[PDB]
C-alpha cells in the first residue's frame, strides 16, 4: 500500500530510473552478441568437444537466457520501476536472473576445477569425460530450477498507490515471508556461493603452481646445462646430469600447451615425447662418459643436448610460459567477477532481508540495488573467460576485430 520513505525515494530516484537502464543497456549490447558468438563457436566451430567447452557453452547459455529479457528490464526502470507485462512474466525475469546468478558460479567451479584437474591428474577419455560433463550440466540446470521454486511461485508484484507504480522483485509484496526469504538467501550464500568459491579459488592455487612447476623443470634443465659447461671437477658434472634427468622425466609426464585438448594417445602428443626420448638418451650418453672417468669428453655431450633442445624442445616447451600467463589472467578475470558480481550480491542479499526481518526496513536498500545491477556484469566478463580457455574462441574473437 505504501513503502518506507527510504525505499520510495530510491524507487523515484535517478539511481533506478537512469543509472540502472544505462548499465543494463550496455550489458545488452555487449553481452548478447559476445555470448551469442561464443555459444555458436562451442556448438558449430569447436571440433574438440572437451568438458571445458561444454561448461562454457552452458555459461554462455545462462548469460543469453537472462540478457534476452533485458529490453523489458530496461523499459521497466526507464518508466519509474513500473511493470505492466504481468505477474508470470515478472517471475520469468526473476527466475532467469537468479538462474544465471547461480549457474555462473557453479559452471565457473566446474570449469576451473576441470582445467586444474587436467594438469594435476590428466586422463584420456575425451569422449566419455564429455558425456559426463553434459550430465553434470543437466544436473546443475535441474537443481537450480528446483532451488529457484520459492522465487517462481511467490507473488512478486505489488501496486504502490503513493508511487502509482507496479514494482517487480524490488518490493516484497508479503512482508510476512521475510523470515523464509532470509534463511533461503543465507542457505544459497553458503552452499552455492562460499562453498563453490572455496573450490574455485583453490583450483587456481593448484593450477597456477603446477604451471609454474612445468616452468621449474624447464628452468632446472637450462640451469644445470649452464653449470656443466662452466664446471671443472667430475662430481659437479655427475650431479648436474642426474638433476637434469629428473626434471626432463617430470616434464615428459606433463601436458604441453601447443597441443592442449589433444589426447595423450594422439600423434601430435607423441612428437613432444619423441623429442624428450632423444634428449633423455643424450643425458645417458653423457653419464656413461662421466661414470667411466672422462670429464672433458660428459662436458662435450652437453653441447649436443643444446642442439636437441633448440630443435624439438624449444618448439613444444616454447610456449609454456605463455600458458602460465593465460591462467593468471584467467584467475584475475574470475576474481574480479567474484569481487564485483558475486560477493556484493550474496553478502547484501543476506544483509537486506536480515534488516527487514529485524526492523522492517533496510538502509542497505540502495547498495542492494547497485549490487544486483553490477551482478549482471558477469555476462560481460564471461567473454574474457572463454578467451583465456577456448583456443577456437580466440580465432573467432581476433578475426571479428
Amino acid at each position, epitope marked *: *500500500f*505504501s*513503502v*518506507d*520513505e*527510504f525505499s*520510495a*525515494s530510491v524507487l*523515484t530516484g535517478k539511481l533506478t530510473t537512469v543509472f540502472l537502464p544505462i548499465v543494463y543497456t550496455i550489458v545488452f549490447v555487449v553481452a548478447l552478441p559476445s555470448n551469442g558468438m561464443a555459444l555458436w563457436v562451442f556448438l558449430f566451430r569447436t571440433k574438440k568437444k572437451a568438458p571445458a567447452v561444454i561448461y562454457m557453452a552452458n555459461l554462455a547459455l545462462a548469460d543469453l537466457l537472462s540478457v534476452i529479457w533485458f529490453p523489458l528490464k530496461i523499459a521497466y526502470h526507464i518508466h519509474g520501476n513500473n511493470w505492466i507485462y504481468g505477474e508470470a512474466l515478472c517471475n520469468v525475469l526473476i527466475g532467469f536472473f537468479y538462474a544465471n546468478m547461480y549457474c555462473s558460479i557453479l559452471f565457473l567451479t566446474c570449469l576451473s576445477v576441470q582445467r586444474a584437474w587436467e594438469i594435476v591428474n590428466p586422463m584420456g577419455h575425451s569422449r566419455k569425460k564429455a558425456n559426463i560433463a553434459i550430465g553434470i550440466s543437466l544436473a546443475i540446470w535441474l537443481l537450480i530450477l528446483l532451488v529457484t521454486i520459492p522465487l517462481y511461485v511467490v507473488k512478486q508484484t505489488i501496486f504502490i*498507490p*503513493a*508511487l502509482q507504480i507496479t514494482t517487480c522483485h524490488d518490493v516484497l509484496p508479503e*512482508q*510476512l515471508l*521475510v*523470515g523464509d526469504m532470509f534463511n533461503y538467501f543465507l542457505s544459497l550464500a553458503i552452499g552455492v556461493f562460499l562453498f563453490p568459491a572455496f573450490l574455485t579459488a583453490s583450483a587456481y592455487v593448484l593450477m597456477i603452481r603446477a604451471l609454474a612447476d612445468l616452468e621449474d623443470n624447464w628452468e632446472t634443465l637450462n640451469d644445470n646445462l649452464k653449470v656443466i659447461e662452466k664446471a671443472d671437477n667430475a662430481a659437479q658434472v655427475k650431479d648436474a646430469l642426474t638433476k637434469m634427468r629428473a626434471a626432463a622425466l617430470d616434464a615428459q609426464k606433463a601436458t604441453p600447451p601447443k597441443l592442449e585438448d589433444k589426447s595423450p594417445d594422439s600423434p601430435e602428443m607423441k612428437d613432444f615425447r619423441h623429442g624428450f626420448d632423444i634428449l633423455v638418451g643424450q643425458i645417458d650418453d653423457a653419464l656413461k662418459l662421466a661414470n667411466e672417468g672422462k670429464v672433458k669428453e660428459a662436458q662435450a655431450a652437453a653441447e649436443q643436448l643444446k642442439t636437441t633442445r633448440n630443435a624439438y624442445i624449444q618448439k613444444y616447451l616454447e610456449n609454456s610460459e605463455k600458458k602460465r600467463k593465460r591462467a593468471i589472467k584467467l584467475a584475475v578475470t574470475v576474481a574480479a567477477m567474484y569481487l564485483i558480481c558475486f560477493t556484493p550480491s550474496n553478502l547484501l542479499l543476506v544483509v537486506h532481508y536480515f534488516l*527487514i*526481518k*529485524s*526492523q*522492517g*526496513q533496510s538502509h542497505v536498500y540502495a547498495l542492494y540495488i547497485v549490487a544486483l545491477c553490477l551482478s549482471t556484469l558477469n555476462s560481460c566478463i564471461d567473454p574474457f573467460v572463454y578467451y583465456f580457455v577456448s583456443h577456437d574462441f580466440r580465432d573467432h574473437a581476433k578475426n571479428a576485430l
Partner: antibody
Amino acid sequence: EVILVESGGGLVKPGGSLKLSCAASGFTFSSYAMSWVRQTPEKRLEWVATISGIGSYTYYPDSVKGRFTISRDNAKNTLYLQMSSLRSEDTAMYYCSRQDYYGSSYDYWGQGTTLTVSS
Amino acid sequence: QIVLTQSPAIMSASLGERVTMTCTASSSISSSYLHWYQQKPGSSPKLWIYSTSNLASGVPARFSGSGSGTSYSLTISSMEAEDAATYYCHQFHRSPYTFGGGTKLEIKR
C-alpha cells in the same frame, strides 16, 4: 533533537470545520512521512491519516474517509488536518507523529491538542 | 483490519520483578510490523521497541521485547518506579493501522 507542537482544538460546534497546525523542527520535513493519531477520553489510540513525504498522497480509514483532509506544506514546515461535518465521537486528543519507515513507524511524537466537540 | 488485544489491560507489579505483557492479533502479522509505545499521563506516547525486538534511542537495556507471528510480548528484566505507565502495541501490516488496548502498569504496595 526532534520536537513537534500541535496548535488548535478547543470548543467546536458539532457539524462544523476546524484546522490543526503541527510545527516541525530539527529535521528535513520533505525527507520524512507524517501522520495524525487521536486518543479518545477512555485513553484508546486510533489512526486518523498518514501523508507520504514525496507529495499529496492521502489515505484514511472507512470511518474517517470523506470528512478529514490532511494538508501538507514542505516550504512552511507545518502539517495541517482539516475537518468537515464534525461529530461528538471526534472528542479526542489529536497527536502529530513523524513516520520514518513502515517498520520504524512513529519514532517521534508531538504533545497533543484538546478537542471538545460540544454545542 | 487486524484486532489487537492486550492481556492484561491492567497489572500490578512490585519493583525488581520480571514484568511480561502480551499483545494478541486476529490474523498473522510480520515480526517487522509490531511496535511498542510508552505513555505517561499528560505526555505523548513515545516509541519504545520497534519491530518486536529492536530498541529505540534512549531506551534502557532492562527492556527486551520478544514474539513473532500471532504472539508478541514486552519483557522487563528489572521492574522500576519510572516503568509505571500505559503500554501500547501498534501494527502497520494492513490498513487501518490499529493500536492495542493498553496495558496499565502500576506499582504493587
